[PDB]
């Protein structure tokens, strides 16, 4: 890999610089290089990895949606034939997106997840695994769609089971995991009732634990709780 000659600490330093410069592709490459050093990641380092790839894939998802919408409109009755270009370019963006997802899943499998023993790291990585299978699911068409959905579900479920056993209901990782699993249910799995139930229970159990928290932890937890509430408003 191109980052094989750079020190781990230098890669982390440059990832932080790239974040400041809003150079997320570079940030992702630097964090990939850091992971490939083979050492476990700290909490801050895990978060850098997450931010970098979320921003990269986020760009791709937004683009793919634009192109997919144009494509669907071309396939309506009364629409003028414009040749293969829309499909071709949507396919190009889609392939790049799938490549980014595969890269992240590869890092998790080789070997972040297997070395992660603490609840905070293991849940973080398993949530990521769910997330990147969910992003694959967004663009998947057919039966391979089914296996991708099941892979996302399985990762989220394993993460949920650990988080419920090992973390307080207000833990931001636990909250973010439940939020994203609820989005999976609603947006991917055609299970809006499961989504609503999960969001409601997550919100209520966190509410009841807020009293245990410092002012700063309270702010961190309530930020994510508000997103659960925003979704419940959207969904009901």
């Amino acid at each position: 890999g191109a980052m094989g000659s750079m020190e781990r600490a230098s890669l982390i330093q440059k990832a932080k610089l790239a974040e400041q410069a809003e150079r997320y592709e570079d940030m992702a490459a630097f964090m990939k290089g850091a992971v490939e050093k083979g050492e476990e990641l700290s909490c801050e380092e895990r978060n850098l990895l997450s931010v970098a790839y979320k921003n990269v894939v986020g760009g791709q998802r937004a683009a793919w949606r634009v192109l997919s919408s144009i494509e669907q409109k071309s396939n309506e009755e009364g629409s003028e034939e414009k040749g293969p270009e829309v499909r071709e370019y949507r396919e190009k963006v889609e392939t790049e997106l799938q490549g980014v997802c595969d890269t992240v899943l590869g890092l998790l499998d080789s070997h972040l997840i297997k070395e992660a023993g603490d609840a905070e790291s293991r849940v973080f990585y398993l949530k990521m695994k769910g997330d990147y299978y969910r992003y694959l699911a967004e663009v998947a068409t057919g039966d391979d769609k089914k296996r991708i959905i099941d892979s996302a579900r399985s990762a989220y479920q394993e993460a949920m089971d650990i988080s419920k056993k090992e973390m307080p209901p207000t833990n931001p990782i636990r909250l973010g995991l439940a939020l994203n699993f609820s989005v999976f249910h609603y947006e991917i799995a055609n299970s809006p009732e499961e989504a609503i139930s999960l969001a409601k229970t997550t919100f209520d159990e966190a509410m009841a634990d807020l009293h245990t928290l410092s002012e700063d932890s309270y702010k961190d937890s309530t930020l994510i709780m508000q997103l659960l509430r925003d979704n419940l408003t959207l969904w009901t």
Binding site: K54, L179, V183, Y186, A195, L223, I224, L227, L234
Partner: peptide, 10 residues
């Protein structure tokens, strides 16, 4: 309007 997932935050 799509559902909101977890943003970039610690």
């Amino acid at each position: 309007q799509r559902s909101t997932s977890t943003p970039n935050v610690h």
